[PDB]
C-alpha cells in the first residue's frame, strides 16, 4: 500500500500484506502477554517444613497429653516455620511461534498506520549530542511521546534521547511489540522501513 510523508511528500511502496492486513485481537494479545512474562525473572523462594531451621524431635508424646497430636515444630500449621507449598525460582517465559510473532507484529504495524499513529519521514539525525536540540526538533513536530526507529543506530541520536523519558531511539532489528503498542507515536525513517519488510518477509 501507499505510505505518505509529511515533510518530503514522497511516495513510498510497501507490501499491503505486512501493512494492510486485518487486526488480529487474539493473536496480538497472546504475543504481548508472552512478552511481559518473558520479562520476569522469578527470583523468589520460601522454606518448606524440611528447609526450616529446627529439629525433628516430637514436641510431646503421642498419647497422654491433653492437647492435639503434634509431629514437629516445623509443621505448616505452626507459628514460626511452615509454608505448605513453598515457592521456588521458576522461569515464566513461554514459547511463541515464529510465525505467530511475525503475524502479531504485522497486525500491529497495520493498525498503527490505520490510526495514523505511524509517521514515515526521511533521515532523522541530530548534528550534536545535545538533548536540547532533540527536544526542539520534536517540539515543532508536536510530538512528545515518540519511538524513533532508524535503520542505522548512531551514538549521536542515542545520547540525545537518553535523558528523554518520553522519547525512545531504536533500530529496526531491535523492535518489540510492547514498545510499538505502548508509545503514542512511532517515527520510522525511510531506511528503517525497508529493513522491516526484509525481516518480516
Amino acid at each position: 500500500m501507499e505510505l505518505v510523508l509529511k515533510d518530503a511528500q514522497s511516495a513510498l511502496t510497501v507490501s499491503e500484506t505486512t501493512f494492510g492486513r486485518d487486526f488480529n485481537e487474539a493473536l496480538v494479545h497472546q504475543v504481548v502477554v508472552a512478552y511481559a512474562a518473558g520479562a520476569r525473572q522469578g527470583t523468589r523462594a520460601q522454606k518448606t517444613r524440611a528447609e526450616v531451621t529446627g529439629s525433628g524431635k516430637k514436641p510431646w508424646r503421642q498419647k497422654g497429653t491433653g492437647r492435639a497430636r503434634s509431629g514437629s515444630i516445623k509443621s505448616p500449621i505452626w507459628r514460626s516455620g511452615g509454608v505448605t507449598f513453598a515457592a521456588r525460582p521458576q522461569d515464566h517465559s513461554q514459547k511463541v511461534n515464529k510465525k505467530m510473532y511475525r503475524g502479531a507484529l504485522k497486525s500491529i504495524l497495520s493498525e498503527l498506520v490505520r490510526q495514523d499513529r505511524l509517521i514515515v519521514v526521511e533521515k532523522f539525525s541530530v548534528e550534536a549530542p545535545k538533548t536540547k536540540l532533540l527536544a526542539q526538533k520534536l517540539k515543532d513536530m508536536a510530538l512528545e511521546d515518540v519511538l524513533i526507529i532508524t535503520g542505522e543506530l548512531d551514538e549521536n541520536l542515542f545520547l540525545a534521547a537518553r535523558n528523554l523519558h518520553k522519547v525512545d531511539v531504536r533500530d529496526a532489528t531491535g523492535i518489540d511489540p510492547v514498545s510499538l503498542i505502548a508509545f503514542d507515536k512511532v517515527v520510522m525513517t525511510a531506511d528503517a522501513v525497508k529493513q522491516v519488510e526484509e525481516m518480516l518477509a
Binding site: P59, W60, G64, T65, G66, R67
Partner: peptide, 17 residues
C-alpha cells in the same frame, strides 16, 4: 502459653473389663 513438662498420667489405672 508454654506446654507443661512433667506430663503425669492423668488417666487412672482402673480398667472396666
Amino acid at each position: 502459653n508454654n506446654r507443661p513438662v512433667y506430663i503425669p498420667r492423668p488417666r487412672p489405672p482402673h480398667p472396666r473389663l
